[model samples]
Target: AGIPDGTTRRRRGTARPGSKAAKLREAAIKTLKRHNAAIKSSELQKEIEKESGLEIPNMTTFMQSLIKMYPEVKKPYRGQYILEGEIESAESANELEHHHHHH
Candidate 1:
């Protein structure tokens, strides 16, 4: 009675495509495609899951890091997110001083 097991499994390859984070980013953008709106994590997860064919849910709900790269992503209602519109909130600091001078 010495050693009673002969079946073991092991992985011998890379995860591929830089990393899963980037993949989600790519897929996220692909899903939104210029749509200005936040997608629910549950829905987004399902979308990317179907799109990329990876354990996207593994990225988990808090996917800020993955979506972080693209400025379009946001936390609406503290839930899922996405962005794709020329949005900019610049305060009107329009200084009014024109002496009409040259040089």
Candidate 2:
């Protein structure tokens, strides 16, 4: 294998960095850099897996959460994502937020 995973070496002992979401976030950006910066369904999963070295599971809510989680991940619609530095924000999401009420 081109990569190394030695038990005796235990140099850095790369553990789960916070959890799966964080792991994907890190990997996802790496994928975006080499890719077109606009990734789509299933392929996104596969790419993230390649970058993170972990196969995904279930993955329903995980995909949905990325719209808000990653600043670089934007929408052109659904089942799609674009890099923020290049594309304009879609019309769907409301600009309003933190409106805890006028009380």
Candidate 3:
């Protein structure tokens, strides 16, 4: 029952940054920004579904990829993130030239 004869399957792990995984991360990041840096996996999946009409079955891998690819976009406070304060000094100065568009 566990394995009939020689059944074999290849596991598909997290996608790389330069691949389709990057696209997903970018899309999710955009969605999160649109939602004011507040989002859950279920919500992100729904947004991806609405945008591409493709349901994402697993967000665990997506989250993992997102964190790895875009470490800058992370939880800074208790439960919110906004372009990490550590780099804000330099980023803030750069923002003035672009009219408050901080990077």
Candidate 4:
């Protein structure tokens, strides 16, 4: 079964650029990039909510949508994510290799 047409639908997931919600998600990405390490979804939810006043309703779905939109966004561990360039550091390269072996 599917939802009926013309009903009030809630948009819940990674938001596209230029909107307020999208700006919040972008800020979340910037924060993760600055850390240069993967962050847990719980931590990211708290961080984004504190900084952007946008509470993430479904952290998993949101991140999934985000990664789909931007391939550079990586999820190295369950409920954790990091930017592709963030793992480019010489120190983190070994970490990346370690993660690659698991897949």
Candidate 5:
């Protein structure tokens, strides 16, 4: 059977809410939180893949999306990134908006 009308479908590795994409994103953030330091994209890629058991295609693009969602994530000095508690703040803001929208 074909997919239902108006339903969205994502490719295997795509990041969607509550999917491995979000899981992988969280894994990367947790890694950064663990070390409490900025890390290179190459290293972060491996760490995230290792932790999540998922290979991310075109990691640069993935990281860029991450920065967009979590504004506090910074890419400084060539391929290095720092997550400065931005994820929590953004999540809180998103949660508030989500609840407000439902009301």
Candidate 6:
């Protein structure tokens, strides 16, 4: 066997855009938006599962992935999240929510 070592082999399918990490991120953001700028990880996970029609392994994994993968995102309060500045402004999020709610 002249193949390269296991470590040398690139992971297949990771180059694609819709890997688990990407989907988890998509789900997490959507969950946050649906929650109007604040949501606990467990509740986010439940909404993500329901809305995305997907099952993530657990809340811990979801929380870790959000932190590790999306540095631009932030959690200002424990178990809650918002885009960096939106952590300080409920007005902006509420505006966006209003649009989505009415239309």
TM-score of every candidate: 0.52, 0.52, 0.47, 0.58, 0.62, 0.52
**Top-down lDDT ranking:** 5, 4, 2, 6, 1, 3
**Top lDDT model:** 5
* Clash tally, candidates in order: 1, 0, 0, 0, 0, 0
Candidate 1 TM-score, C-alpha based: 0.52
Runs of candidate 2 exceeding 4 Å displacement: 1-18, 86-103
Global lDDT scores for all candidate models:
0.62, 0.68, 0.56, 0.72, 0.77, 0.66
Better of 2 and 3 by lDDT: 2
Instruction: Find the 10 residues in a row with the least total lDDT in model 5.
Output: 85-94
Winner on TM-score (4 vs 6): 4
What's the lDDT of the predicted structure labeled candidate 3? 0.56
Better of 1 and 2 by lDDT: 2
Off by over 4 Å in 1: 1-12, 15-19, 34-36, 57-62, 84-103
> Could you tell me which residue pairs clash in candidate 5?
none
**In candidate 6, what residue range of length 10 has the lowest lDDT sum?**
84-93
Position 23, candidate 5: lDDT: 79
Ten consecutive residues with minimal summed lDDT in candidate 3?
A: 79-88
- Give the residue spans of candidate 3 off by over 4 A: 1-19, 75-103
What digit string (tens of lDDT, one per residue) describes model 5 on residues 1-103? 6888786576455544677678788887777777677798888998999998888867878888877877778777698988675345343355676574653
The TM-score obtained by model 6 is: 0.52
Can you give the lDDT of residue 52 in candidate 5?
Answer: 82
